[PDB]
């Protein structure tokens, strides 16, 4: 059990697969999405492996909130001064493709409603 | 300034409440975009995620944990999408921080 696991995102955490990194600390990593859906589109992920939000534990609250605080700070650092949308996809109906928790941050254009 | 979400927290206008604790409130969205569409909001008036403080971390994480628990209780066993909107480009509709939780249909990509 390599730390962070062997999903795409676990490999990125251990520098085994390349990524365009915006910010890194002891708890999380922010990097650009390889298939962007907006002019700016990045991901914020914990270093701790949690497969999906539906299985997060109560004591994971601080870490999940940290993803949002880092996401909003990275958005400011990238000049997203008109705003942005944060997204978590859970399971099949959420469209989830990578089973390591992650927060999308999208901006640099007008986002539409409904959010998919 | 006050918002309609402040009025909902204070019980001044009605909403279909799903869950409440000492620090947040979850309730069905009045303009639902999926068969299940609810909001989880802090009782603290944070106007937008861009002005949240570092010491709000665990409160924000609490919104997500409450959101995922309410989703399971509402029977969203095939999954769901969580969304926080910021500002004009994000489509933020009320200037009181709120986590959307949507499910009961396939959610699509891009997410708006
Ligand atoms: N190697 C990679 N580097 C950066 N982003 C990725 C990589 N592989 C997948 N993604 C993105 O990860 C997200 C996974 O889908 P989802 O689980 O629905 O959020 C998608 O937006 C992908 O484009």
UniProtKB/Swiss-Prot annotation, chain B:
Alphabetized InterPro entries for the sequence: Histidine_triad_CS, Histidine_triad_HIT, HIT-like, HIT-like_sf
* Position of sequence motif Histidine triad motif: 96-100
Q: Which disease is it linked to?
A: Neuromyotonia and axonal neuropathy, autosomal recessive: An autosomal recessive neurologic disorder characterized by onset in the first or second decade of a peripheral axonal neuropathy predominantly affecting motor more than sensory nerves. The axonal neuropathy is reminiscent of Charcot-Marie-Tooth disease type 2 and distal hereditary motor neuropathy. Individuals with NMAN also have delayed muscle relaxation and action myotonia associated with neuromyotonic discharges on needle EMG resulting from hyperexcitability of the peripheral nerves.
Function according to Swiss-Prot or TrEMBL:
Exhibits adenosine 5'-monophosphoramidase activity, hydrolyzing purine nucleotide phosphoramidates with a single phosphate group such as adenosine 5'monophosphoramidate (AMP-NH2) to yield AMP and NH2. Hydrolyzes adenosine 5'monophosphomorpholidate (AMP-morpholidate) and guanosine 5'monophosphomorpholidate (GMP-morpholidate). Hydrolyzes lysyl-AMP (AMP-N-epsilon-(N-alpha-acetyl lysine methyl ester)) generated by lysine tRNA ligase, as well as Met-AMP, His-AMP and Asp-AMP, lysyl-GMP (GMP-N-epsilon-(N-alpha-acetyl lysine methyl ester)) and AMP-N-alanine methyl ester.
Q: Describe its assembly.
A: Homodimer. Interacts with CDK7. Interacts with RUVBL1 and RUVBL2 and is associated with the LEF1/TCF1-CTNNB1 complex and with a KAT5 histone acetyltransferase complex. Identified in a complex with MITF and CTNNB1. Interacts with CDC34 and RBX1, and is part of a SCF (SKP2-CUL1-F-box protein) E3 ubiquitin-protein ligase complex. Interacts with SUMO1, SUMO2 and RGS17. Interacts with the Ten-1 ICD form of TENM1. Interacts with CALM1; interaction increases in the presence of calcium ions.
Name the reported effect of residue 83 to M. Answer: Loss of SUMO-specific isopeptidase activity
Q: Which GO terms describe its molecular function?
A: adenosine 5'-monophosphoramidase activity; deSUMOylase activity; hydrolase activity; nucleotide binding; protein kinase C binding
Residues with Phosphoserine modification: 31, 58
Q: What is this protein called?
A: Adenosine 5'-monophosphoramidase HINT1
Q: Which species does this protein come from?
A: Homo sapiens
Which positions carry N6-acetyllysine? 7, 16
Q: Which CDD domains match?
A: PKCI_related (cd01276)
The membrane-spanning stretches of this chain are none
The record lists the catalysed reaction(s) as:
adenosine 5'-phosphoramidate + H2O = AMP + NH4(+)
A cellular component term from Gene Ontology for this protein is: extracellular exosome
Query: Altering residue 96 to A: what's the impact?
Result: No significant effect on affinity for 3-indolepropionic acyl-adenylate and tryptamine adenosine phosphoramidate monoester
Question: What tissue specificity does the UniProt entry give?
Answer: Widely expressed.
State the encoding gene: HINT1
Outcome of altering residue 79 to D? In NMAN; loss of homodimerization; significant decrease in adenosine 5'-monophosphoramidase activity; approximately 40-fold increased affinity for tryptamine adenosine phosphoramidate; loss of SUMO-specific isopeptidase activity
């Amino acid at each position: 059990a390599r730390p962070g696991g062997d999903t795409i995102f676990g490999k990125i955490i251990r520098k085994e697969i390349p990524a365009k990194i915006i910010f890194e600390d002891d708890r999380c990593l922010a990097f650009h999405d390889i298939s962007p859906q907006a002019p700016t589109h990045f991901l914020v992920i914990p270093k701790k492996h949690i497969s999906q939000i539906s299985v997060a534990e109560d004591d994971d609250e601080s870490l999940l909130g940290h993803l949002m605080i880092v996401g909003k700070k990275c958005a400011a650092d990238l000049g997203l001064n008109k705003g942005y949308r944060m997204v978590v996809n859970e399971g099949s109906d959420g469209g989830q493709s990578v089973y390591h928790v992650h927060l999308h941050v999208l901006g640099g254009r007008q986002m539409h409603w409904p959010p998919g």
